[PDB]
Amino acid sequence: MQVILLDKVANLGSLGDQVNVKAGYARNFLVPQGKAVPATKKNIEFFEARRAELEAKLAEVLAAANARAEKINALETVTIASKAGDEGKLFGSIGTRDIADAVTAAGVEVAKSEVRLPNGVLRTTGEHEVSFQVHSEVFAKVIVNVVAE
Amino acid sequence: MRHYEIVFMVHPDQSEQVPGMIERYTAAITGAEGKIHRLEDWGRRQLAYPINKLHKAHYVLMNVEAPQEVIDELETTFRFNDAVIRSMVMRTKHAVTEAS
Amino acid sequence: SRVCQVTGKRPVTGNNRSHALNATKRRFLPNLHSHRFWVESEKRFVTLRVSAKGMRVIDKKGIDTVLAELRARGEKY
Amino acid sequence: AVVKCKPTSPGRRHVVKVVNPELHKGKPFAPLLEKNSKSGGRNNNGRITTRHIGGGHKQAYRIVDFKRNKDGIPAVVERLEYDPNRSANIALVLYKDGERRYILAPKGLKAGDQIQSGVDAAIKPGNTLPMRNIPVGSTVHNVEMKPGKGGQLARSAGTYVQIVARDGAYVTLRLRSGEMRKVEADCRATLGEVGNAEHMLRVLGKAGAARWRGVRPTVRGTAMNPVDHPHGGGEGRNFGKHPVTPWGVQTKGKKTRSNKRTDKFIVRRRS
RNA sequence: GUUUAUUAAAAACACAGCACUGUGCAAACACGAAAGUGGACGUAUACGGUGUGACGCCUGCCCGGUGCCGGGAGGUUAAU
């Protein structure tokens, strides 16, 4: 494919490459997410002066703004005080919804889709490490303290 | 009421949660209108053979006078729990004292 | 029916000629697939049951040109 | 109990009736009944598809609550009713908030027992709860295939499923036929065995118990014609062929299980 | 009980019972180019097909050929 790239792909993308990829990767991942634009004799002219000169640094400062959005919450901890069972065995498993609402109500205003859970649905009541996908390289180290009630 | 000598083993990170279970069990004892006799926690020590691995389990003796309905409910709370592994209830034989 | 939206492909009839040249009428069916396209001119999802050759044509052309051809032919998108 | 009838006439000699004396003798709860129109084995095209059914006594559909969407609510079992579309009995249960619902009646259930539902349900039989608070090794029934489906497994009379393994978010179950299969741990199940376990002991006595139930007499392949069946023909009880279906598919041993979508869930096949 | 309406009412068909086989649900199978239905608003004490035909005594041998199932070591093997 002659598809020019826009985002910093961690495998082959380095902001302006013409690396040959398959059509299923470009049509289903790169185009609908805004990661890359198919270049056929006019998008090359669009990327030549209007995109690589101004909008690449705009994407870089939007990545810096995502880093600042990570740097909004300086505490980087969430104390969940939901209702629990008798001596452990928590009542309801907390998914990404309640964690996203607790971080959004006080701290980072990131959406639910960037929230990732390394240790499952967090059935064990205690200290847990939760990372956020605010950026493709820099990750979060949120310390969630599940407290039994 | 009959004297029932309860011995049960607990897993270690849930043996950190043993005194709350002791408070719940003595609340059931207070509901049984019986007096507790042996609050001697034997403690966390080494097992003799692999019983559902991560060794050195927690021994607790109870030795309380109780009726039959309360001990049936307290045995169903034993068998239906992942924390209580190997509980047992023994005879009366004029229930006993120190130097275990 | 099995009509491609972009290229207009439709099933035709042919012969299933064996080793003894036995003419048996059968039907040639196109490789139709219902794929969901992201449209940037409309910024939305468009579900189209198209052929894979039509998918290669859309891989060549722009999606706005394909939707303009569907608007010119009066097709629903 | 299981009462064998006396041979008062030719036909009552082999009648063995499964008489449950605890069933309610009366009309069921009317807002939980709807119509159940008979089909006779015919599709929308009007041709027969599932043969050898038709006729028999009428029946009305009972809306049996499968999902048990109420959570944290006590439930007092009002009475036991006989569902004609099932093999086991159903239970009319009066909830705490005043809503009467039909559920599947387990084995250890009488008039006056108290059950509940939710994740805070106990291990007493009759309670419906998901498969993440159940101790591994017990007996469950009314097993959902997907979270929120309602229940597909272990709902005939006497059928029970025993929990074998718990691998993370997967529950490996041994089914009634003996097929090890993995399901989702978020699916719900009702504890205990399904009641009316003597229902297999009825041997129906006569042809009439087959006729008024909906079981039509089956014609053998040897009695048929070569144009009607692949078997048949010959000048007097000639078989001379291999056992096949009437549509040319081999029977008496042929694996037709071919979907290739749920083969990951199946661990060990039926033996 | 049913059957060749209009030469055969029977030992024929069928029957509850018994055995084999398949099927873990969007099940098998069937109608339908397909959608969609029956099965079933049932789900392994259920359904479909096959063989036999209450009940008592029972059902002995053989995998050579054919049919079915399993295993892929090896030979052969089209389409690309």
UniProtKB/Swiss-Prot annotation, chain A:
Keyword Acetylation set for record: yes
Superkingdom in the source lineage: Bacteria
Residue numbers of N6-succinyllysine PTMs: K71, K83, K112
Gene Ontology cellular component annotations, sorted alphabetically: cytoplasm; cytosol; cytosolic large ribosomal subunit
PROSITE patterns found in the cross-reference section: RIBOSOMAL_L9
One Gene Ontology term of the molecular function aspect: structural constituent of ribosome
Sorted UniProt keywords: Acetylation, Ribonucleoprotein, Ribosomal protein, RNA-binding, rRNA-binding
rRNA-binding listed as a keyword: yes
An individual GO BP term: cytoplasmic translation
Chain positions with N6-acetyllysine modification: K89
NCBIfam families named in the record: L9 (TIGR00158)
Family to which this protein belongs: Belongs to the bacterial ribosomal protein bL9 family.
Function: One of the primary rRNA binding proteins, it binds very close to the 3' end of the 23S rRNA.
Subunit structure: Part of the 50S ribosomal subunit. In stalled/collided disomes (pairs of ribosomes where the leading ribosome is stalled and a second ribosome has collided with it) bL9 in the collided ribosome contacts bS6 and uL2, while it contacts only helices of the 16S rRNA in the stalled ribosome; the inter-ribosome bridge thus formed is different from that formed between normally translating ribosomes.
Designated name of the protein: Large ribosomal subunit protein bL9
Swiss-Prot record, chain B:
Reported modifications of this chain: 5 different forms of the protein, varying only in the number of C-terminal glutamate residues, were isolated. The sequence shown is form bS6-6, which is the longest. The first two Glu are encoded by the rpsF gene, the other Glu are added post-translationally by the RimK enzyme.
Chain coiled-coil ranges: none
Assigned keywords, A-Z: Acetylation, Ribonucleoprotein, Ribosomal protein, RNA-binding, rRNA-binding
Gene Ontology molecular-function annotations: mRNA 5'-UTR binding; small ribosomal subunit rRNA binding; structural constituent of ribosome
Single biological process term from Gene Ontology: cytoplasmic translation
Positions of transmembrane segments: none
Modified residues (N6-acetyllysine): K93
GO cellular component: a single term: cytoplasm
Protein family (similarity comment): Belongs to the bacterial ribosomal protein bS6 family.
Role noted for this protein: Binds together with bS18 to 16S ribosomal RNA.
Quaternary structure and interacting proteins, as annotated: Part of the 30S ribosomal subunit. Interacts weakly with uL2 in one of the 3.5 A resolved structures.
UniProt-recorded name of the protein: Small ribosomal subunit protein bS6
Entire-sequence positions represented here: 1 to 100 of 135
From Swiss-Prot, chain C:
Keyword tags: Ribonucleoprotein, Ribosomal protein, RNA-binding, rRNA-binding
Biological process according to GO: cytoplasmic translation; ribosomal large subunit assembly
Cellular-component GO terms for this entry: cytoplasm; cytosol; cytosolic large ribosomal subunit
UniProt-listed Pfam families: Ribosomal_L28
Molecular-function GO terms, alphabetical: rRNA binding; structural constituent of ribosome
UniProt KW Cell inner membrane keyword: no
Family note: Belongs to the bacterial ribosomal protein bL28 family.
Subunit structure of this chain's protein: Part of the 50S ribosomal subunit.
Identification of the protein by name: Large ribosomal subunit protein bL28
Organism: Escherichia coli (strain K12)
Chain's gene name: rpmB
UniProtKB/Swiss-Prot annotation, chain D:
Pfam families in alphabetical order: Ribosomal_L2, Ribosomal_L2_C
Keyword set includes rRNA-binding: yes
Keywords: Acetylation, Ribonucleoprotein, Ribosomal protein, RNA-binding, rRNA-binding
Residue span of region Disordered: 27-52, 220-271
Compositionally biased tracts (Low complexity): 38-47
Record SUPFAM superfamilies: Nucleic acid-binding proteins, Translation proteins SH3-like domain
Residues bearing the modification N6-acetyllysine: K241
Cellular component terms (Gene Ontology): cytoplasm; cytosol; cytosolic large ribosomal subunit; DnaA-L2 complex
Disulfide bonds: none
Entry GO MF terms: RNA binding; rRNA binding; structural constituent of ribosome; transferase activity; zinc ion binding
Source organism superkingdom: Bacteria
Known role: One of the primary rRNA binding proteins. Located near the base of the L1 stalk, it is probably also mobile. Required for association of the 30S and 50S subunits to form the 70S ribosome, for tRNA binding and peptide bond formation. It has been suggested to have peptidyltransferase activity; this is highly controversial.
Family according to the record: Belongs to the universal ribosomal protein uL2 family.
Note: This protein can be partially replaced in vivo by its H.marismortui (HmaL2) or human (L8, from the 60S cytoplasmic ribosome) homolog.
NCBIfam families reported for this sequence: rplB_bact
Name of the protein in question: Large ribosomal subunit protein uL2
Source organism of this protein record: Escherichia coli (strain K12)
Name of the gene this protein is made from: rplB
